Design a protein around this motif. Structure first.
Motif, PDB file in Angstrom:
ATOM      1  N   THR A 153       0.853  -1.185   0.000  1.00 49.35           N
ATOM      2  CA  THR A 153       0.000   0.000   0.000  1.00 49.35           C
ATOM      3  C   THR A 153       0.891   1.238   0.000  1.00 49.35           C
ATOM      4  O   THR A 153       2.116   1.153  -0.128  1.00 49.35           O
ATOM      5  CB  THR A 153      -0.954   0.009   1.206  1.00 49.35           C
ATOM      6  OG1 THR A 153      -0.193   0.050   2.420  1.00 49.35           O
ATOM      7  CG2 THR A 153      -1.853  -1.220   1.213  1.00 49.35           C
ATOM      8  N   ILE A 154       0.260   2.401   0.138  1.00 47.05           N
ATOM      9  CA  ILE A 154       0.955   3.662   0.376  1.00 47.05           C
ATOM     10  C   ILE A 154       0.209   4.388   1.486  1.00 47.05           C
ATOM     11  O   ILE A 154      -0.990   4.663   1.355  1.00 47.05           O
ATOM     12  CB  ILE A 154       1.034   4.547  -0.879  1.00 47.05           C
ATOM     13  CG1 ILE A 154       1.949   3.917  -1.927  1.00 47.05           C
ATOM     14  CG2 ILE A 154       1.524   5.938  -0.512  1.00 47.05           C
ATOM     15  CD1 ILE A 154       1.971   4.667  -3.241  1.00 47.05           C
ATOM     16  N   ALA A 155       0.903   4.681   2.582  1.00 39.37           N
ATOM     17  CA  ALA A 155       0.328   5.416   3.699  1.00 39.37           C
ATOM     18  C   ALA A 155       0.889   6.829   3.692  1.00 39.37           C
ATOM     19  O   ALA A 155       2.103   7.017   3.576  1.00 39.37           O
ATOM     20  CB  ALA A 155       0.631   4.729   5.031  1.00 39.37           C
ATOM     21  N   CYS A 156       0.004   7.815   3.814  1.00 38.60           N
ATOM     22  CA  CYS A 156       0.390   9.214   3.733  1.00 38.60           C
ATOM     23  C   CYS A 156      -0.472  10.027   4.683  1.00 38.60           C
ATOM     24  O   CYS A 156      -1.417   9.518   5.292  1.00 38.60           O
ATOM     25  CB  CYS A 156       0.259   9.754   2.300  1.00 38.60           C
ATOM     26  SG  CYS A 156      -1.421   9.725   1.607  1.00 38.60           S
ATOM     27  N   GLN A 157      -0.130  11.303   4.816  1.00 37.87           N
ATOM     28  CA  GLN A 157      -0.958  12.244   5.548  1.00 37.87           C
ATOM     29  C   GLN A 157      -1.981  12.865   4.606  1.00 37.87           C
ATOM     30  O   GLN A 157      -1.842  12.812   3.380  1.00 37.87           O
ATOM     31  CB  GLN A 157      -0.104  13.339   6.186  1.00 37.87           C
ATOM     32  CG  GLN A 157       0.459  14.335   5.190  1.00 37.87           C
ATOM     33  CD  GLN A 157       1.437  15.303   5.821  1.00 37.87           C
ATOM     34  OE1 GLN A 157       1.804  15.161   6.988  1.00 37.87           O
ATOM     35  NE2 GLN A 157       1.879  16.285   5.045  1.00 37.87           N
ATOM     36  N   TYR A 158      -3.022  13.444   5.190  1.00 35.14           N
ATOM     37  CA  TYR A 158      -3.970  14.210   4.398  1.00 35.14           C
ATOM     38  C   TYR A 158      -3.213  15.347   3.723  1.00 35.14           C
ATOM     39  O   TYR A 158      -2.592  16.165   4.420  1.00 35.14           O
ATOM     40  CB  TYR A 158      -5.102  14.761   5.261  1.00 35.14           C
ATOM     41  CG  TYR A 158      -6.359  15.109   4.485  1.00 35.14           C
ATOM     42  CD1 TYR A 158      -6.349  16.099   3.510  1.00 35.14           C
ATOM     43  CD2 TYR A 158      -7.558  14.458   4.740  1.00 35.14           C
ATOM     44  CE1 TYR A 158      -7.491  16.420   2.806  1.00 35.14           C
ATOM     45  CE2 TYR A 158      -8.709  14.777   4.040  1.00 35.14           C
ATOM     46  CZ  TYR A 158      -8.669  15.759   3.074  1.00 35.14           C
ATOM     47  OH  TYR A 158      -9.810  16.083   2.373  1.00 35.14           O
TER      48      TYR A 158
END
Length: 282
Positions: A70-75
């Protein structure tokens, strides 16, 4: 005993030691650094791993827990919308999972732009959002879904499915059930769009960096990590993968804050208890 307080205590002890090790130093060579004073991190002490950063413009990380990629990021900040949209297009994003509530997004104080529920133009990129279905996740929690069409001159027009959880359930078996239903919804939506790219011979299927589901709540470390863990347990390939494993992998690849709250680790412990999955590594 395998899911009692003693097992929880040892798990918390190992995850805490890892967070201390992953604590960002000043200008830490492990973490992305802002340029010219431009605001890169939505939160000061929640930073982005340099080894796995998707873009130098964003607080986003490639994450592979077991076999789930996956790719986890901030808003994304307002100043990051163009680069954020460029990430989603170049990624061939099979699903975009937004975990911020409609109440939080609408609150101007939090600085979370409504970039997936309306048309707009950001740089040389044009975005058009069309609302599709609504999937109930249980306990009154609804997931609004959108088809996000990203267009840029000379660039291939990319459609990105979106799963937006409008409200969040209360702590307990409502949250672990809703998280379990959300992981299935995000996996199904991704698998449909990924298969579409596969039927057209898209070279993105052979790139490990592309076709990754994108997940973000607000800082990308709380509900995001809670969802990412629910998805790797939903993946059949990730058998015998412990909670210590997936939390360690999420933290070594993004930051030591992944699974920020005990309530979020508690959700993972309960889901793993439902599968007979181990919490600790032997």
């Amino acid at each position: 005993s395998p899911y009692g307080p003693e097992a929880r205590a040892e798990l918390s002890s190992r995850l805490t030691t890892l967070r201390n090790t992953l604590a960002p130093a000043t200008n830490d060579p492990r973490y992305l650094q802002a340029c010219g004073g431009e605001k890169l991190n939505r939160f000061r002490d929640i930073q982005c791993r340099r080894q796995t950063a998707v873009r130098a413009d964003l607080n986003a990380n490639y994450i592979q827990v077991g076999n789930t990629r996956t790719i986890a990021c901030q808003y994304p900040l307002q100043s990051q919308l163009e680069s954020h949209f460029r990430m989603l297009a170049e990624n061939r994003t099979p699903v975009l999972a937004v975990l911020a509530s409609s109440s939080e997004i609408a609150n101007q104080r939090f600085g979370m732009p409504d970039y997936f529920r309306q048309s707009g133009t950001y740089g040389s990129i044009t975005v058009e959002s069309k609302m599709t279905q609504q999937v109930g996740l249980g306990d009154g929690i609804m997931a609004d879904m959108y088809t996000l069409t990203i267009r840029e001159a000379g660039q291939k027009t990319i459609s990105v499915p979106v799963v937006h959880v409008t409200t969040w359930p209360d702590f307990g078996v409502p949250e672990s059930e809703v998280t379990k239903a959300l992981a299935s919804l995000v996996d199904q939506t991704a698998e449909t769009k990924r298969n579409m790219y596969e039927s057209k011979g898209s070279s993105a299927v052979a790139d490990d960096s592309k076709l990754r589901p994108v997940i973000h709540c607000r800082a990308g470390v709380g509900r995001t990590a809670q969802l990412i863990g629910a998805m790797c347990m939903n993946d059949s390939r990730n058998s015998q993968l412990s909670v210590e494993d997936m939390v360690s992998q999420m933290r070594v690849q993004r930051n030591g804050i992944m699974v920020q709250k005990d309530e979020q680790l508690d959700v993972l412990i309960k889901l793993a208890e439902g599968q007979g999955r181990p919490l600790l590594n032997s």
